[PDB]
């Protein structure tokens, strides 16, 4: 049994809700919240900008030290950093950004990072400002992630389309 409330069950392991990932994080304090990161961990906008704002920029300060030591992530890759006031840990995952011309086949590699964590609160990778079709992102999620994932979708409108169209 876990804390997550109000989710629709899509499969054995994937759940979905109309929620902003941050408010949900603040309420649940999950072990892992996933960030929709870029390779530079520059949390300017989208989910990343919202998560970082909710940490009062502490996520960005920590991320800048990570990059100064380790250099950029790979597209499709991830790192585990603090969850600050939102979660125990933040899994920063880099989905391909279609608005930079990155290969959408890297979306499966991105979701494979979730399998290293038994339970996660996450957004749909590569959606919003990364330009991918969220219906496609949900399909790759369901077909890739085997651990228990609670997806938060940032719009009542879109949420309803993902559910209605789910096979
Ligand atoms: C969950 N998902 C979010 N995304 C923003 C737009 C598109 C998206 C697919 C649903 C991802 C955000 C943004 C801020 N807070 C969020 N929580």
Swiss-Prot record:
Question: Which chain positions lie within coiled-coil regions?
Answer: none
Q: Which reaction does it catalyse?
A: Thiol-dependent hydrolysis of ester, thioester, amide, peptide and isopeptide bonds formed by the C-terminal Gly of ubiquitin (a 76-residue protein attached to proteins as an intracellular targeting signal)
State the source organism's domain of life.
Answer: Viruses
> Where does it live in the cell?
Host endoplasmic reticulum membrane
Q: How is its activity regulated?
A: Inhibited in vitro by GRL-0617.
- Residues in Macro domain copies: 1-167
* Topology of this chain in the membrane: Multi-pass membrane protein
Q: How does it assemble?
A: May form homohexamers. Interacts with N protein.
Annotated function = Responsible for the cleavages located at the N-terminus of the replicase polyprotein. Participates together with nsp4 in the assembly of virally-induced cytoplasmic double-membrane vesicles necessary for viral replication. Antagonizes innate immune induction of type I interferon by blocking the phosphorylation, dimerization and subsequent nuclear translocation of host IRF3. Also prevents host NF-kappa-B signaling. In addition, PL-PRO possesses a deubiquitinating/deISGylating activity and processes both 'Lys-48'- and 'Lys-63'-linked polyubiquitin chains from cellular substrates.
Q: What's the protein name?
A: Papain-like protease nsp3
Question: What species was this sequence derived from?
Answer: Severe acute respiratory syndrome coronavirus 2 (2019-nCoV)
What are the leading ranks of the lineage?
A: Viruses, Riboviria, Orthornavirae, Pisuviricota, Pisoniviricetes
Q: Which gene encodes it?
A: rep
Parent-record interval covered = 1025 to 1191 of 7096
């Amino acid at each position: 049994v876990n804390s997550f409330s109000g989710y629709l069950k899509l499969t054995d392991n994937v759940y979905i809700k109309n929620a902003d990932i941050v408010e949900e994080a603040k309420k649940v304090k999950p072990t892992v919240v996933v960030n929709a990161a870029n390779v530079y961990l520059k949390h300017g906008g989208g989910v990343a900008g919202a998560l970082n704002k909710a940490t009062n920029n502490a996520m960005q300060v920590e991320s800048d030290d990570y990059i100064a030591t380790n250099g950029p992530l790979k597209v499709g890759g991830s790192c585990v950093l603090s969850g600050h006031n939102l979660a125990k840990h933040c899994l920063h995952v880099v989905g391909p950004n279609v608005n930079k011309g990155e290969d959408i086949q890297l979306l499966k590699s991105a979701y494979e990072n979730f399998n290293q964590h038994e339970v996660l609160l996450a957004p749909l990778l590569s959606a919003g400002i990364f330009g991918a079709d969220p219906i496609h992102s949900l399909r790759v999620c369901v077909d890739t992630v085997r651990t228990n994932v609670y997806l938060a979708v940032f719009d009542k409108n879109l949420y309803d389309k993902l559910v209605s169209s789910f096979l």
